Design a protein around this ligand. Structure first.
Ligand SMILES: OC[C@@H]1O[C@H](O[C@]2(CO[C@]3(CO[C@]4(CO[C@]5(CO)O[C@H](CO)[C@@H](O)[C@@H]5O)O[C@H](CO)[C@@H](O)[C@@H]4O)O[C@H](CO)[C@@H](O)[C@@H]3O)O[C@H](CO)[C@H](O)[C@H]2O)[C@H](O)[C@H](O)[C@@H]1O
Ligand SMILES: [Ca+2]
Ligand SMILES: [Ca+2]
Length: 490
């Protein structure tokens, strides 16, 4: 009747998840009450403390564990394999794996086991996938018009435009408050690395792309990569970059965005940052000095291996298996991912069409989509399939919109036929990767920011590449190539 789950949630959502409208209804439908350990910041560190201290719940919900954490917890009996539970008790998930057996392959570790329950969300395929580009570039069209500038078409045009922003007071308040170029450095949706491809190849959060020769490329040791750093260095030297770019956080970014202080900035959806207005639009793909005109593909996709694991201290496997499966009901999945209907005390993402027993997205009327979603979503293991649109739920209008934009502006410039596939390496290979990445990942972003602030990449470039080799890049790259080959050979 009672299970104890650990979970992750947004600091905008209730400290107690049972305050969420979805979870109140779910209790009345499963008849299972969940007592939550809900971490709303630094979830992974806090999860690792609990596991290390032996302070295990029945299951970790909305977990987001890496594959190396999954295999290590599995080698040690922290979590259990779950395939027999799916076959015995999970008809909603079994039906999904019937329709789309490809995901079953993605859930199966090389030792034949399944250790987690995935998040599945189909929104585009291949180049047209909503994940192809995460850190989209946006520009203040109102400043362009005010200053009589055309949309920039090249990186050189971008510099000239940005200097106008710094110097031309297009907000008209008589102060040089204009921030020409902003970002939030590192992984994720507000980084600037989307522009590195205007110098050829570019970059992504993996620092990994697949060349058309079949050979994976570590992007962050290319000359094109150095040229992109040199480009941002020009912007810094020219006083075009947000004074705060390497210190501020999301909440500060969004404050500035709401005051419309940005010339060009990066984000998933401008509505989350500069709001619902036509002051900002997509910065179209720019041509580099030599006519480079490219969009690097991310390796992202509408699949996450682990949004739930089951711990070895879980004493009612059947009930837990059946609770989980209730999330894989179409209508439930839709809500768990995106929000709910019929709250009279808070804005609703959905309305319930009782005529069709189906969900209809409502208009946000200026509410930031990520803001209302964070409060009312649940996360966790769920599947939303392409066959659900027009049947179970409307497609979200911000997802349909973004997909249109990806087709319009970006897909024509994705010259790479392949990106890196979602492979499940062996545990021996995962721990090798994890040792190299322990050195490499921080180091790459550290050098990148030092180089934009000092100006010595040209003097430091070769030492940096040797250092990456001492950290094991060739080994790192050889492993990734092996799995790409095995994936292509099937
Ligand atoms: O790193 C912490 C960890 O991140 C994990 O997920 C997030 C994103 O979760 C959301 C994502 O919401 C969107 C993107 O959603 C889709 C694509 O899946 O895009 C469509 C709209 O264009 C939408 O229909 C699709 O579902 O991302 C923007 C905000 O960036 C939203 O407007 C949009 O819905 O992020 C939201 C706010 O955090 C959350 O409500 C959503 O679930 O990964 C990125 C980090 O790289 C997010 O920070 C993180 O949320 C993981 O789910 C986990 O929950 C933690 O966030
Ligand atoms: Ca001004
Ligand atoms: Ca390379």
């Amino acid at each position: 009747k009672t299970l104890k789950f650990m979970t992750a949630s947004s600091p905008l959502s209730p400290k107690d998840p049972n305050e969420k409208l979805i979870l109140q209804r779910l209790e009345k439908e499963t008849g299972v009450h969940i007592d939550w350990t809900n971490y709303q910041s630094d979830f992974a560190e806090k999860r690792n403390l609990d596991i290390s201290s032996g302070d295990l719940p029945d299951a970790i919900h909305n977990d987001g564990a890496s594959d190396v954490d999954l295999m290590n917890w599995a080698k040690k009996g922290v979590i259990i394999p779950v395939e027999d539970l799916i076959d015995k008790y999970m008809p909603n998930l079994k039906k999904i794996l019937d329709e789309k057996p490809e995901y079953k392959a993605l859930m199966t570790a090389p030792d034949g086991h399944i250790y987690s329950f995935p998040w599945i969300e189909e929104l585009g395929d291949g180049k047209e996938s909503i994940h192809s580009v995460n850190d989209m570039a946006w520009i203040n069209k109102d400043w362009l018009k005010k200053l009589g500038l055309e949309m920039p078409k090249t990186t050189d045009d971008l510099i000239k435009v940005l200097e106008a922003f710094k110097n031309g007071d297009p907000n008209g308040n008589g102060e040089a408050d204009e921030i020409p170029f902003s970002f939030i450095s590192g992984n994720g949706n507000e980084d600037f690395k989307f522009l590195f491809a205007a110098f050829g190849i570019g970059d992504n959060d993996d620092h990994l792309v697949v060349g058309n020769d079949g050979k994976v490329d570590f992007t962050a040791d290319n000359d094109n990569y150095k040229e992109g750093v040199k480009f941002i260095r020009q912007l810094q030297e020219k006083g075009l970059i947000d004074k705060e770019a390497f210190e501020h956080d999301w909440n500060s970014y969004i404050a500035k965005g709401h005051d419309q202080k940005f010339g060009v900035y990066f984000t998933w959806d401008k509505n989350n940052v500069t709001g619902s207005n036509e002051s900002y639009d997509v910065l179209p793909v720019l041509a580099g000095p030599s006519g480079q005109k490219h969009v690097a593909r991310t390796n992202g996709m509408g699949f996450a291996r682990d949004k739930m694991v089951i711990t070895s201290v879980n004493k009612n496997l059947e009930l837990t298996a059946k609770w989980i499966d209730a999330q894989y009901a179409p209508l439930q999945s839709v809500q768990n991912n995106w929000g709910t209907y019929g709250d009279d005390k808070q804005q609703n993402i959905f309305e319930l069409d009782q005529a069709s027993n189906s969900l209809k997205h409502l208009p946000l009327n200026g509410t930031a989509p990520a803001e209302l979603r964070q409060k009312t979503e649940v996360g966790g293991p769920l599947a939303i399939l392409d066959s659900y649109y027009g049947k179970v739920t409307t497609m979200p209008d911000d997802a349909k919109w973004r997909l249109d934009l990806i087709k319009e502006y970006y897909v024509p410039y994705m010259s790479n036929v392949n990106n890196y596939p979602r492979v499940f390496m062996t545990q021996e290979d995962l721990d090798k990767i994890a040792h190299i990445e322990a050195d490499m990942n921080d180091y790459i972003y550290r050098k990148r920011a030092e180089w934009i602030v000092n100006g010595n990449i040209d003097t430091e470039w070769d030492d940096y590449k040797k250092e990456l080799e001492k950290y094991g890049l060739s080994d790192y790259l050889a492993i990734k190539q092996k799995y790409y080959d095995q994936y292509q050979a099937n």
